[PDB]
Design a protein around this ligand. Structure first.
Ligand code: MG
Ligand code: MG
Ligand code: MG
Ligand code: MG
Ligand code: MG
Ligand code: MG
Ligand code: MG
Ligand code: MG
Ligand code: MG
Ligand code: MG
Ligand code: MG
Ligand code: MG
Lengths: 131, 172, 116, 178
RNA sequence: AAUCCUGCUCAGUACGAGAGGAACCGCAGGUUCAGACAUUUGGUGUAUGUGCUUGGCUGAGGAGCCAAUGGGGCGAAGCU
RNA sequence: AACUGCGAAUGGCUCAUUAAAUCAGUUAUGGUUCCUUUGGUCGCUCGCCACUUGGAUAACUGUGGUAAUUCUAGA
RNA sequence: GGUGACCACGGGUGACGGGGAAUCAGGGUUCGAUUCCGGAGAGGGAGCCUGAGAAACGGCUACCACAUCCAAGGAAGGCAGCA
RNA sequence: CGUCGCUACUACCGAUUGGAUGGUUUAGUGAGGCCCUCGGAUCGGCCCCGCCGGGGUGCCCUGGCGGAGCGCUG
């Protein structure tokens, strides 16, 4: 397969990111990061391609007071792509998925990081284009 | 791969039709055998090798890769005259039509097995040569022979015995 | 030795250098350094920045046709014959026009005979 | 990469495949409507000069002169610019066109011969195909045949002979106008 | 003074009626920690390095200065 | 087959919008435009081709590109 | 300055307007999307070429809402026309 | 006749900066179109003016090959 290399994290717990899908949500409030053991006082952080748990603060009322899986697809902190490219995006954004990784929405607004696209196939199939 | 005209032209003959079902224990290769015979024969059935053929019509059936629903297909073909001499039944011409019914192999789908048995007149029984006769093959054979179906046997996965098991010829 | 990038300022961005930026509209840009990146974010046109390649090109810093007369063949004729035909003898040409004159004269004679 | 070579004086434009960017560098970073030396494609091609007439992209989008970009951009196409045909009078249509800058990201390069080298490549620089139709205008045929003042212009049109095995071969002349 | 996990192959395999469902070798990576380091990206920045600019001051220009670092843009080396 | 000229702005459907708005009557446009039809006007001006001037461009023949379009380039 | 209890202004309409339809002592009261005339529109706006005539949509261009193929580079949409 | 007790329905007030669906807008961003001011990638024409062919007789008729004039122009 080939796992994702490490990237600069940038987005800790408490961050509010855009929701790029078409579920009617507006933003995701990251409440945790999947697969992070942690350390004393170290806030759990997530980069692109990571799965987070989030609650939407704005959006359709049937989505708001619930916890949802999500995957970060664009981040504003620059990350190295193991070939010299220090790439960063204009905004922090993610999409809402389920546990198996299927995207709850059906279209993705804006670009999607290559790490996210390679880690998740169905996100890639919904992606407008890859940056 | 021909039009429905010759389908009717071979359908009206009633001594060259063979309504049959394939029956086996789970994880024995029934879907694989059905799709290989779809690859070879078929009224319009082609030889696509994209995993599973039309016998898995359901998205969940393909997703979990457990056979659920039964789908009936038709295989028309022809064989040589010196081999037609072997058929001691009622024969007519060169074209032969088969109505295969792929029934699910789980014990919980024995109702679909019975429903398929009502339609069918002959059966192919499939047995893995590694596992031998398991529970479900015995049960479906009981059902078929109570429904008065002639079964013909076929041992699948000989490659498993000759490579995975490394069986010598005598014990094979 | 990857693909040789180009910043907005036109300089060749070498591998391991610079920084790439992906806007949300799907447009990807490359900046040679933080100076280039900060200027682009400030939305200052490179054409008013005295040291950029676009500026030098715009300010001109550091800085025919063929009417041919081919003569070929024509379908249904001969290449060797057509040049001779178009360069025929002027004596032959004047003989041709006078024989056309007498052809017209005898056509008048025939027309008068038919109309009579 | 496919490359059409078109000789004006002879016609019979042909296709050549090339798989050496080592010799395609002499066309890299050029522009169309410019003339280049085609000698890098062989000693057989030495002494030959061409002009970049056109090309077809990797996508199939033809390249139009007057883009100044090594790639495709969308333009507003009105009547008679290039790469467009109007279905209605004055109709316009936005469609992408490959730029005039030539590089490796193409499929077909259309080159026109402007100078003939010593080594005539067979098929292209020989067996000149004739002009498709004889001139139809009176002044055209007059100027071409150097006829001064009515030298049997009535008969001096080329009579095209039609020949085929399952018929009776004949010849017929066009109608002269003006 | 190293620590632990995940994914691929094993394998939809052994096992099991079925549902489900591993492991050894190997491979690719990460968590936590440790020891360093500045090629790259970022941070700093009084090189008070170079532009811009507010008020005042040297008769004006030029060049400058003061406002406890005048403010700000970019910034070498170094440190990180 | 194609260029050119004309038609495609008529007809068909539907009543969402629209409350002096639309629309109905009446009137004006001496405050404006108007292909098409018809009737006027077309030697009314003093001004080395006129037995007639130029370059192409279609359609057409060949080279094609694109997975693809009533997509199009080169000669 | 202009318009307003002679109802301006605003809101609503399940309002296209009329010629007209129903009911019928007389007076009136409901209904008119509906084949005639006028108006508006072509999924929502907007802006345009051609053309005497269009802000045309079985013309174009851009955004938006939907949605088709795709080899993932791309192309192509408008049945409130007859079915 | 009314209170209180129970049962169904119907509305009312009600913290919740309640929520949803239309419309109209301030501000900002603003695609695209058109107009204007530039822009001149190319395509021609005049000045061929290097050649050959040449002409009433190198004093060319120019059919053309072809450097170019590298100016004047649409
Ligand atoms: Mg703590
Ligand atoms: Mg005529
Ligand atoms: Mg000062
Ligand atoms: Mg001064
Ligand atoms: Mg002080
Ligand atoms: Mg700084
Ligand atoms: Mg007209
Ligand atoms: Mg209404
Ligand atoms: Mg009505
Ligand atoms: Mg009407
Ligand atoms: Mg309209
Ligand atoms: Mg319209």
């Amino acid at each position: 397969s080939g796992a994702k290399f490490r990237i600069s994290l940038g987005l800790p717990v408490g961050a509010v990111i855009n929701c790029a899908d078409n579920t009617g949500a507006k933003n995701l409030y990251i409440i945790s990061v999947k697969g992070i053991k942690g350390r004393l006082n170290r806030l759990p952080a997530a980069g692109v391609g990571d799965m987070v748990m989030a609650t939407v603060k704005k959006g359709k009322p049937e989505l708001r007071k619930k916890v949802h899986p999500a995957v970060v697809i664009r981040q504003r902190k620059s990350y190295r792509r193991k070939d010299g490219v220090f790439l960063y995006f204009e905004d922090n954004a993610g999409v809402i998925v389920n546990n198996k990784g299927e995207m709850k929405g059906s279209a993705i607004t804006g670009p999607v990081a290559k790490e996210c696209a390679d880690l998740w196939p169905r996100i890639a199939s919904n992606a407008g284009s890859i940056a | 791969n021909f039009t429905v005209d010759q389908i009717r032209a071979i359908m009206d003959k009633k001594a060259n039709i063979r309504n049959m079902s394939v029956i086996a224990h789970v994880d024995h290769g029934k879907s694989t055998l059905t799709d290989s015979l779809v690859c070879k024969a078929g009224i319009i059935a082609s030889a696509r090798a994209g995993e599973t053929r039309f016998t898995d019509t359901r998205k969940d059936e393909q997703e979990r890769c457990i056979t659920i629903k039964s789908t009936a297909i038709s295989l028309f073909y022809e064989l040589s005259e010196n081999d037609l001499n072997f058929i001691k039944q009622s024969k007519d011409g060169a074209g032969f039509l088969i109505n295969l019914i792929d029934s699910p192999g789980h014990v919980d789908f024995s109702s679909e097995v019975t429903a398929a048995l009502r339609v069918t007149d002959g059966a192919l029984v499939v047995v893995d040569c590694v596992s031998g006769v398991c529970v479900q093959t015995e049960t479906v054979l009981r059902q078929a022979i109570a429904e008065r179906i002639k079964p013909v046997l076929m041992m699948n996965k000989m490659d498993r015995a000759l490579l995975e098991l490394q069986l010598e010829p005598e014990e094979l | 030795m990857k693909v040789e990038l180009c910043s907005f300022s036109g300089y060749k961005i070498y591998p391991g250098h610079g920084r790439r930026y992906a806007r949300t509209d799907g447009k990807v840009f490359q900046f040679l350094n933080a100076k280039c990146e900060s200027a682009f974010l400030s939305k200052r046109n490179p054409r008013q920045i005295n040291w950029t390649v676009l500026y030098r090109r715009k300010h001109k810093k550091g800085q025919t046709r063929r009417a041919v007369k081919f003569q070929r063949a024509i379908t249904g004729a001969s290449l060797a014959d057509i040049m001779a035909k178009r360069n025929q003898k002027p004596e032959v040409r004047k003989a041709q026009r006078e024989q056309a004159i007498r052809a017209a004269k005898e056509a008048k004679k025939a027309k008068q005979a038919s109309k009579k | 990469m496919k490359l059409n070579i078109s000789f004006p004086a002879t016609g019979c434009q042909k296709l050549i495949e090339v798989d050496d960017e080592r010799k395609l560098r002499t066309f890299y970073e050029k522009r169309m409507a410019t003339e280049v030396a085609a000698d890098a494609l062989g000693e057989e091609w030495k002494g030959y000069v061409v002009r970049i007439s056109g090309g077809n992209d990797k996508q199939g989008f033809p390249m139009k002169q007057g883009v100044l970009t090594h790639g495709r951009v969308r333009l507003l196409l009105s009547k008679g610019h290039s790469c467009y045909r109007p279905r209605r009078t004055g109709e316009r249509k936005r469609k992408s066109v490959r730029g005039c800058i030539v590089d490796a990201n193409l499929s077909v390069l259309n080159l026109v011969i402007v100078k003939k080298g010593e080594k005539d490549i067979p098929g292209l620089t020989d067996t000149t195909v004739p002009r498709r139709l004889g001139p139809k205008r009176a002044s055209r045929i007059r100027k071409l045949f150097n006829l001064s003042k009515e030298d049997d212009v009535r008969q001096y049109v080329v009579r095209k002979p039609l020949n085929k095995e399952g018929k009776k071969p004949r010849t017929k002349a066009p109608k002269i106008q003006r």
